[PDB]
Amino acid sequence: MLVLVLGDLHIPHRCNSLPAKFKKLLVPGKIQHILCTGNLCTKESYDYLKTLAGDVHIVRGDFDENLNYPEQKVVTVGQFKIGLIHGHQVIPWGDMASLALLQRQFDVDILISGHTHKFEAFEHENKFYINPGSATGAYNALETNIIPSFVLMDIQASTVVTYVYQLIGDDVKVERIEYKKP
Amino acid sequence: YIRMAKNKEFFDALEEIAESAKNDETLRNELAKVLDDILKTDPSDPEAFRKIVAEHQEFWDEHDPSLMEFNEGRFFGKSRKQYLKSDDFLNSTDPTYNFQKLHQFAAEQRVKLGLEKSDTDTLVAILKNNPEECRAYIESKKPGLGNFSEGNVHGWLKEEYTPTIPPKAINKSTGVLSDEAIKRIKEQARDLLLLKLINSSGNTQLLKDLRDAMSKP
Amino acid sequence: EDFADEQSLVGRFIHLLRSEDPDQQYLILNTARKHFGAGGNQRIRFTLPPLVFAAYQLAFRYKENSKVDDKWEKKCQKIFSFAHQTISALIKAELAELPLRLFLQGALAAGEIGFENHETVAYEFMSQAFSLYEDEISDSKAQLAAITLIIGTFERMKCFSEENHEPLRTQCALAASKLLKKPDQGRAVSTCAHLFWSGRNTDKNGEELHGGKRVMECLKKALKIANQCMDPSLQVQLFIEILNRYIYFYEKENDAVTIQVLNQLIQKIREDLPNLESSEETEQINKHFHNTLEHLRLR
């Protein structure tokens, strides 16, 4: 099954839309689960993501205008137990150990962060951590290296393929990292 | 002197042997080693290409010893060693049978070899998957259709992936299995399928197992 | 509907005209505000935020222009002052949360840029939020989020001198204790543990504080606020959340955090754990601990 992980859009605050090629890709009828890290911020962008898939799991992100989104969240999909959080909640913003702390407190196999606008994915003490980065590729004070990215997972079962979609230039350069339950 | 290159002979002699090996499974497993060796070894380097072929003399004499041989007596400055890594044994820049082309061939035969007695899921796969995709799949069925990975074949590249949302794993390794080459392979796939398909004229698990590789959304 | 379309169309415009001449951009932005910070309190609310971000970007653009422009440092100021005026005009349209963070991301911005007469515009942006914090932030729910942001925002920043770091550090400590509820205090106080360690400040040439003692202060204080939570389920989880946050500070080579504290903190939590009823809320924290054993087990 296909899990679309993204976030940090900041519409309209920091960016007027998603990059042409990304909107062109993300069509309805190819996704079952979405795990958005936030900063949508508007209803406009909630209603986009609800079109794309049946299941949709937002979190509360520092600039979100809706209150009703949940700060922290977890979901079991397949064999996997995933953790999801916008990531400003973790201090020091996007440190290692703080993101591991948050794993233990959650007891999750996968843990999605955000806020840095910078993609990462890696294995650390037999548990996985993701961050799709900016879908829009929006501003950030701390970084000026912004590569519009979103992630797709293929959880087969006891085996997750972690595709990362980046937009370098005007081409869509995709890499892949496979992780599997210990 | 000796002023005609063994290139064409060797090339042709593989096609002869591959034919024999379709039946003889002990010759097949023996041939695979030979093909793998040429593939792994680098036709950029001249000597090594000559080396690796000559090192398999024991195999080049199983079918046709006429490949390796030359009259070592009565020729000054064409001693036995000197010939086997010379331009005369195998011309580095033969306009037709370029070391490169023999490599590019070798692989073609490698895939065709393992094709011979591979299963129905395999054949069907090789037909559906497009030029780019088919190359990937050949890695994906390692090492049955041959060892194609970054270090076991010289010209082989890193597997790349599409923007299409379920992202298909592909390859753009044209410097081994050319779009031309791969088209031949498909041809031999459906040859091998069609030929197999006639010999059970009602039902059975081929026609269940075909329906499984075919209806796979 | 009439408020959703119009707000898209200012996103569009500042981009339509986009030049690569910095000063031209500035004229545009200016000429945006002129013509899109007008219509009552209906638009000005959710129309200016763009421009404020968009300004910060342009401020960065002047730092790429390191050698090309001499008056870039003065042009940074020109921009930030353009923010101040623009965030304020949200306050004057009675707004609280949005302008608070808009100051913060600005406050970060100047911080990372590092221009002439910048540290002065760093403080001013921070305290402007803080002045909005205490003045207009009620509901203990969003009172928490609104304070934790301010903390981690600051935490990151390296652009402050000790002389102006200290007051904002403990300005947080106040706001940490000044929360309504008991759990929300005890966590928030422990969140203020960082600012005294990895909260950077240009004093040892852009390095961490390494002030291990002032961490222990803000970890003790929480543990006391841990007893002062009535519920047994609060108490145990809060001990554990503080235990893990103790651990972190050991693993970061801080020798202020010693084993004595930890074993005593552990032992306590071994014994308290059985008292909770065998149920869903209880089936979580007994795993949390199990995972904090094994993490400590390797290390």
Swiss-Prot record, chain A:
Reported impact of residue 90 to D: Impairs interaction with VPS35
Effect of residue 174 to D: Impairs interaction with VPS35L
Localization: Cytoplasm; Membrane; Endosome membrane; Early endosome
Residues with PTM N6-acetyllysine: 50
Residue sites binding Zn(2+) 2 per the record: 39, 62, 86, 115
Tissues expressing this chain: Ubiquitous. Highly expressed in heart, lung, placenta, spleen, peripheral blood leukocytes, thymus, colon skeletal muscle, kidney and brain.
Family: Belongs to the VPS29 family.
Protein name in UniProt: Vacuolar protein sorting-associated protein 29
One annotated GO molecular function: metal ion binding
Reported function: Component of the commander complex that is essential for endosomal recycling of transmembrane cargos; the commander complex is composed of the CCC subcomplex and the retriever subcomplex. Component of the retriever complex, which is a heterotrimeric complex related to retromer cargo-selective complex (CSC) and essential for retromer-independent retrieval and recycling of numerous cargos such as integrin alpha-5/beta-1 (ITGA5:ITGB1). Component of the retromer cargo-selective complex (CSC). (Microbial infection) The heterotrimeric retromer cargo-selective complex (CSC) mediates the exit of human papillomavirus from the early endosome and the delivery to the Golgi apparatus.
Annotated InterPro entries: Calcineurin-like_PHP_lpxH, Metallo-depent_PP-like, Phosphodiesterase_MJ0936/Vps29, Vps29
Single biological process term from Gene Ontology: retrograde transport, endosome to Golgi
Source species taxonomy: Eukaryota, Metazoa, Chordata, Craniata, Vertebrata
Provenance organism: Homo sapiens
Keywords, ordered alphabetically: Acetylation, Cytoplasm, Endosome, Host-virus interaction, Membrane, Metal-binding, Protein transport, Transport, Zinc
From Swiss-Prot, chain C:
Residues covered by region (Interaction with IGF2R cytoplasmic domain): 19-212
Stretch forming the signal peptide: none
Annotated compartments: Cytoplasm; Membrane; Endosome; Early endosome
Effect of residue 139 to N: In PARK17; decreases interaction with WASHC2C, FKBP15 and the WASH complex; impairs recruitment of the WASH complex to endosomes; shows reduced retrograde transport of selective cargo between lysosomes and the Golgi apparatus; shows a progressive reduction in neurite length and branching
Tissue note: Ubiquitous. Highly expressed in heart, brain, placenta, skeletal muscle, spleen, thymus, testis, ovary, small intestine, kidney and colon.
Region (Interaction with SLC11A2): 1-299
Entry superkingdom: Eukaryota
Family statement: Belongs to the VPS35 family.
Implicated disorder: Parkinson disease 17: An autosomal dominant, adult-onset form of Parkinson disease. Parkinson disease is a complex neurodegenerative disorder characterized by bradykinesia, resting tremor, muscular rigidity and postural instability, as well as by a clinically significant response to treatment with levodopa. The pathology involves the loss of dopaminergic neurons in the substantia nigra and the presence of Lewy bodies (intraneuronal accumulations of aggregated proteins), in surviving neurons in various areas of the brain.
Assembly and oligomerization: Component of the heterotrimeric retromer cargo-selective complex (CSC), also decribed as vacuolar protein sorting subcomplex (VPS), formed by VPS26 (VPS26A or VPS26B), VPS29 and VPS35. The CSC has a highly elongated structure with VPS26 and VPS29 binding independently at opposite distal ends of VPS35 as central platform. The CSC is believed to associate with variable sorting nexins to form functionally distinct retromer complex variants.
Role played: Acts as a component of the retromer cargo-selective complex (CSC). The CSC is believed to be the core functional component of retromer or respective retromer complex variants acting to prevent missorting of selected transmembrane cargo proteins into the lysosomal degradation pathway. The recruitment of the CSC to the endosomal membrane involves RAB7A and SNX3. (Microbial infection) The heterotrimeric retromer cargo-selective complex (CSC) mediates the exit of human papillomavirus from the early endosome and the delivery to the Golgi apparatus.
Name the record gives this protein: Vacuolar protein sorting-associated protein 35
